[PDB]
Amino acid sequence: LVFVVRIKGINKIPPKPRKVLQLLRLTRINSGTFVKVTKATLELLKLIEPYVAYGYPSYSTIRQLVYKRGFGKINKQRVPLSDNAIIEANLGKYGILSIDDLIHEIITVGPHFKQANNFLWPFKLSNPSGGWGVPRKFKHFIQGGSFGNREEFINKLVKSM
Amino acid sequence: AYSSRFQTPFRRRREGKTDYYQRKRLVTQHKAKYNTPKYRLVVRFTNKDIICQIISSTITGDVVLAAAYSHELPRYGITHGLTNWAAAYATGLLIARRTLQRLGLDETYKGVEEVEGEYELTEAVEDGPRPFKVFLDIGLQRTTTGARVFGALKGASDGGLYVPHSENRFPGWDFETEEIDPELLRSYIFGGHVSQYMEELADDDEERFSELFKGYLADDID
Amino acid sequence: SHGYRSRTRYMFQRDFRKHGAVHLSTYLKVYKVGDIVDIKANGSIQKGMPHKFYQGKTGVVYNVTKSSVGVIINKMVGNRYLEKRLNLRVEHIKHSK
Amino acid sequence: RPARCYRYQKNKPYPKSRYNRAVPDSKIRIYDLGKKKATVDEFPLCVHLVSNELEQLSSEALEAARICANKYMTTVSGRDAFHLRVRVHPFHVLRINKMLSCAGADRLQQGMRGAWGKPHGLAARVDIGQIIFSVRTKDSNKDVVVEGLRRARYKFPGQQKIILS
RNA sequence: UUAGGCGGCCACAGCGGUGGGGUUGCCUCCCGUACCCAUCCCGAACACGGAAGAUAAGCCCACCAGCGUUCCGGGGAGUACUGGAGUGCGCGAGCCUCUGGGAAACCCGGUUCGCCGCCACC
RNA sequence: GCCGGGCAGUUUGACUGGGGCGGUACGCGCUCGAAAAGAUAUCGAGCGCGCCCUAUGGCUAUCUCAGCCGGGGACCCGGCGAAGAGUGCAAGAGCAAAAGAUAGCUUGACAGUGUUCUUCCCAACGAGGAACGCUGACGCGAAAGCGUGGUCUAGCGAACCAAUUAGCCUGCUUGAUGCGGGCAAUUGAUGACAGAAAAGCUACCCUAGGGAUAACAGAGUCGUCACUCGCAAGAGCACAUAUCGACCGAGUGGCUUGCUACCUCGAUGUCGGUUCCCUCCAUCCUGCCCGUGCAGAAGCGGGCAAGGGUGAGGUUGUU
RNA sequence: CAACAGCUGGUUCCAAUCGAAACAUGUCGAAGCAUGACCUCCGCCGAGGUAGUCUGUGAGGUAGAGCGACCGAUUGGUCCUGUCAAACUCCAAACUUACAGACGCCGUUUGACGCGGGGAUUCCGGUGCGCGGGGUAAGCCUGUGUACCAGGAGGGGAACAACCCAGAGAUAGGUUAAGGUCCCCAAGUGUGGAUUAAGUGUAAUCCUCUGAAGGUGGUCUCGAGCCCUAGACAGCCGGGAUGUUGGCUUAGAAGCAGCCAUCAUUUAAAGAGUGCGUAACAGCUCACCGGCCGAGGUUUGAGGCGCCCAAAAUGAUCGGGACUCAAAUCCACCACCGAGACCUGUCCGUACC
């Protein structure tokens, strides 16, 4: 799996990309969506590699961002979408414990956000940190740059929104 | 090989067998017992030997239903040279009455015939004897006037198979005559060329071969 | 100048190994009704040739007119209509992936 | 002169003799120096002449910078040692402002389309690291030939590296 | 097919070279022009007719790598080049890092002296 | 009928590194430019067509060259010889039992009517062109089949009017005759080639606009111009470097020139001169110095340095 | 007569949804039109559609490369050897592209895709980047793909259409982006380390920020060669034998223009001499010899900071002040500041239920 957050905005480029930011979802900055690593995937993210952060979050680092920014088809109450507002205690959308268990199945593979407990992407992240890498997107991770992968590189970024 | 910069054309090519740009020629007219990948009433020439084949192509195959090749003649018939036209009228005539109608000849197969009202019965064919056919391709060879290639065609024509060809691009007769000029129909073989080499000093016998042909048109074994 | 043999240069041309006449089999092969066929122009052909623009795209064969098969790119031209005019021979290749 | 809008490649092909005529002859004497024939290649001591730049030296550039080069190679007793090699030829033709084509900078003239520059000179071009013109013999002296090319470079638009044998 | 005919792919099949095979089953070379037919002149070829004689050509079979070609190992080379990103460097030309791809020449060693389809056939 | 700017009305095109002169990139074909689909500009590079052919068309049958060598630069015999000798014409492409050659036959270079593509990528638009059918009638072949002109892409032209081809329709109450009007189609021109019947001057000029576009000045630029630096071939009797100093390379200035066609055409007053102020170097003299191919004298070259100084007349509007 | 103009100017209330074209074909046409592309509105239709990616089946000859593969250029030698191509190709990408399936996204009350109809505006464009063609070049001319300006606010860049962040309902709290934290000015006179002495520099990009083929045993860092405890450098200090000016040559030629020879003697050692030098000598030097303590020495390449090739016009400049174990530069790093972006409360509009 991967987590995608679009650090760079789409000032105007590129057009083929930006198309494939949307379609992921995430039509904004600092938004975040979970993608399964598969073909018909991996192609798109690679295309949008310079735009966004990327990588496996650790789970229990994905639980953190589910609870804070979570779901609901329609943004509304039960805003926290905690375990209670996840798998149906009673009748309702369900799946598992409605917590880390949720971001357990997700991390391995399916189910997807909307598929179970049909509340969909995207994550709406705050974007803070002391700062993100060096300001301005650059070549990549091995340089001042938020670019690319690392399990516990997207952990910090994912953390502190 | 070479640097492989070049590509070589061969298939049948390389060493010659078939031609191309011919043998494609033949084929379009779907002929053979049935639809053919390549069909003919092949005529080959060998020193001291003439061969007639006949058959539609296969993916791998190029089968032949019935063959001639004076050599077998005389099965019945007689011992003489086989490298002459007479005795290359006989075959290609003997093949006819083998390929020509025995195993099967022109497009005749079990089941409904190819689209078109066509029925074939024993005896003269109804609705025209016209449907019998094969195209005869000399292989690599040279078209000449009365040439054995053509001659092979002449018998193995009046053998029932009907092949296109052009008259006046044959030996006439004489070299290979008809017994009687008023009736085209007859089995006819002549070897006049050699005959009259001497007058009838001795040796050659044209008379013997008419003998052969007599046997050919008739109820004979294989 | 302007004409069918416009700037083509390579697209039309077939070189060294495959030069001369081509096999009959391709142009004899029959396709029937909606069959997706690619279009191209094999060089060494002098008939049953489409234009030059539009060569390379697939179209769906439809009925045959004269000795030539309606096919051509039945398919769309650019992002557009399947406005199709097809007059291609079997000589140009058929088949689908 | 000066060579400025001459040796920077901001154009593309030709030379093409078909296309062009009235090319000036090169003023670059033979590109075969020293004793030829015998393989000089058997030698101690090696080479030089590396461009370290982009391109297009004119024949005006090479022909007095190369025999200038040879001149102080004469030290090795006329006909006795080394062979000098030049690499690339001045094929490449350049044209200069003949007011009819376009406007502004050269290879543009007056009007639009029209006079391409009229033929005036030819220059070979080179890459970042190519050997402009090399060859050596046994260590005749410390390296007279190395001294050669000192002078050889210093009449090339590029900064040439001596490069050790 | 202990030798054939028609092909597909169209050099892995090309170039060159060694060895083996038949005599009446095949392919030829071969023998010979009365005929059909033929050479701006020649039965050379084309065409026809035929088996006295051969395997020497061709052809078929086995094989050789020197050249050409194909593919592969290892080296060159993760080099040259490059899609995406960077308050990384440099006066600048230009370079670098991260990410995703990735060559050619040439060298050394193997591979390749066709593969496949239909038909007929001691 | 002829003469007839004496007089009247008009026209006298477009493109175009402003305009004009030159040219046409004004209709059309090929290679490249063109960035490996398609499309793609310039007064972009190379170069062609506005015909020619009754065979140089169509079909069928049959199918060895340049050149070299040897034997008697013509010709005859032999050998070598995959192609260096074709296909009307540009370029590019196609072609070998052929699309090329030779021989024979033949008129499909036919009439009629379509489908489609092109013209005009995408994406509408005519003439024209092409591909592929059918109906009818032929040609050649044994037959499949080929032939809708010349292997493919240039060789083209509206409406009105006339002439021409075959049959038919029709002309004002009516019949006959004459002479007309029409349906389909062929030929005749518009090359500024999707078609007006068409020469110039204006400094006597006028209007509408344009900085969409020139002259003058320009802020940007710095090829040009001025000056410098690096390297130092060479010359200077010997001696690179007292002095002179090429080739090549790197710069600085913004005094010349050019470019920008960027600024202004509801207007930024021309050249030269004059008068009056300030400045630049990169110093001509003067001060203080270094070198010398510095005896001295007179110089030559270099350094610091801008305090001060650095004119009068003859020709020419002249600078 | 209120002449006509394709030319300049002007054309007066609020708000909400969508939102261009500066291109193609024809035109006595290029300061204009028409028809297409493109914008909008309305009616119809009915279930799929395809801006992204992956795979499959196809199209391709540009980059590069190469030419004992055509072609045409282009060296030398007695087969070796030296070079090239916009109008070359035995090869050959990235990549663009037709079609299909898959995932994604989208559509069936927001009706897509598409069909028919009404209304346009528009056919002076421009800039950045990539690829270009012309030209010495241009804030040049002319293409192409794309994003932007035009018609786009707000934050940054000293100022500044298109450079960076960023695409914007009102109001509010919060956190960041670009960029910045010595002062002017919010936030550091931040940490570990090193370079720089030129005020280099404090200048991403660029008409705009120049600098190409002056000097520095100031100091730091890195590399390479050679010499050393058989005692180097100083390494440092001191010294620079007889035949003989070797023979020849030459005006001269005496160790040192050149040719030949390079012996012998006396020696602790000393070449018929390593370089400088003279007209030739002389003279200096090595080469060569003696002494001296004891450990590194010397030659050279590169980089960092600082110091003292490179000329312009009213008053110098990195935005300014001013800064040097930095407030410069490079390698790392920590904490902050800082938008209308992102998060968050309420409200408004619009669409839909």
Tokens of C63: 């009925």
Tell which residue, D36, D53, D33, D43, has the closest CA to residue D133.
D33
Inform me whether the C-beta atom of residue C33 falls under 8 Å from chain B C-beta atoms: no
Interface contact flag, C18 B7, Cβ < 8 Å: yes
Q: Which nucleotides of F are covered by protein (CB under 7 A)?
A: 16-18, 22, 25, 28-34, 36-39, 42-46, 48, 61-63, 90-99, 114-119, 121-124, 130-134, 141-148, 151-154, 223-224, 230-234, 246-250, 259-261
Distance, CA of A71 to CA of A119 (rounded, Å): 5
Cα separation, B139 vs B44, whole angstroms: 6
Q: Cα A113 vs. chain centroid, distance in angstroms?
A: 11
Residue with tokens 């099967």: B104
- Quick count: other Cβ atoms within 10 Å of Cβ D90? 25
Residues 6+ apart with CB under 8 A from B173: B181, B188, B190
| Triad D82, D83, D88: Cα angle to 5° | 145
Q: Resolution of the coordinates in A? A: 11.7
Q: Is B27 on the interface with C (CB under 8 A)?
A: yes
Query: Residue B198 contacts by C-beta under 8 Å, 6 or more apart in sequence?
Result: B204
Residues 6 or more apart whose Cβ sits within 8 Å of residue D6 = D56, D58, D94, D121, D123
Nearest Cα of chain B lies from the Cα of C61 at a distance, in angstroms, of: 23
Distances in Å between the Cα of A99 and the Cα atoms of A36, A63, A66, A96, C82 are: 19, 7, 8, 8, 52
Half-sphere exposure of D59 (CA within 13 A, CB side): 18
Are B133 and B162 contacting, i.e. CB atoms less than 8 angstroms apart?
yes
Q: Are the C-beta atoms of B48 and B82 separated by less than 8 Å?
A: yes
CA distance A111 to A106: 6
Q: What is the DSSP string of D85-143?
A: ----------EE--TTS--SSSS--SSSS-PPPEE---EE---SS-BSS----S--SS-
Q: Which two tokens stand for residue C31?
A: 């396709």
DSSP state of A32: E
Helix (H, G, I), strand (E, B) or coil at A31: strand
Q: Which chain C residues have a beta carbon less than 8 Å from that of B22?
A: none
Specify the nucleotide whose C1' lies closest to residue A44 (CA).
Answer: G53
Provide the CB-side half-sphere exposure for C88 (13 A, CA).
34
Contacts of C21 in chain B (CB under 8 A): 20-21
**What span, in angstroms and rounded, lies between the C-alpha atoms of A158 and D138?**
68
Q: Which amino acid, residue D129? A: G
**Pairing mode, strands B43-46 and D95-96:** unpaired
Residue C17, min C-alpha distance to chain B (Å): 4
Report phi then psi at B220, rounded to 5: -125, 170
**In angstroms, rounded to a whole number, what is the distance separating the alpha carbons of residues D79 and C53?**
65
For residues B43 and B67, give the distance between their C-alpha atoms in angstroms, rounded to a whole number: 11
Residue A58 is given by DSSP the state: P
| DSSP for residue B95 | S
Residue D86's Cβ-count burial label (10 Å; 0-12, 13-18, 19+) is buried
b/e map of C53-80 (b: 16 or more CB within 10 Å)?
A: ebbeebbbbbeeeeebbbbbbbbeeeee
Give me the DSSP letters along C30-97.
Answer: ---SS-EE-----SS--SS---SSS-S--EE-----SSSBS-S--S-SSSS-------B-TTS-----
Residue pair B131/B69 in contact (Cβ under 8 Å)? The answer is no
- Give whole-number Cα distances, A112 to A31, A57, A154, in Å: 17, 16, 20
Q: What does the DSSP 8-state code read for residue B188? A: -
- The count of residues in chain B is 222
Q: Is B2 on the interface with C (CB under 8 A)?
A: no
Burial of B153 (0-12, 13-18, 19+ CB in 10 A): buried
Q: In the PDB record, what is the listed experimental method? A: cryo-EM
Q: Pull the structure tokens for residue A85.
A: 């507002």
Q: Closest partner residue to B21 among C16, C21, C28, by Cβ?
A: C21
Q: How far apart are CA A93 and CA A117, in angstroms?
A: 4
Separation between Cα atoms, residue B165 and residue D115, nearest integer Å: 68
Question: Judging by DSSP bridges, how do beta strands D83-84 and D118-119 pair with one another?
Answer: unpaired
> SS3 sequence, A94-136?
CCCCCCCCHHHHHHHCCCCCCCCCCCCCCEECCCCCCCCCCCC
For residue C24, CA distances in Å to A70, B38, B79, D161 come to 66, 12, 44, 63
Tokens 């011919």 sit on residue:
B22
Taking CA atoms, B179 is separated from B98, B207, B212, B213, in Å, by 23, 11, 13, 10
Residue of C nearest to B11 (CA): C23
* Contact indicator for D49, D132 with CB cutoff of 8 Å: yes
Q: Which residues contact D131 (CB under 8 A, 6 or more apart)?
A: D47, D48, D49, D50, D51, D87, D163
What gap in Å lies between CA B43 and CA B27, rounded to an integer?
A: 16
Handedness of CA A39, A41, A47, A53 (dihedral sign): negative
End-to-end CA distance of chain D: 34
Asked if C51 reaches chain B (Cβ–Cβ under 8 Å), the answer is: no
B-chain CB neighbours of C28 within 8 Å are 28
CB D130, CB D99: distance < 8 Å: no
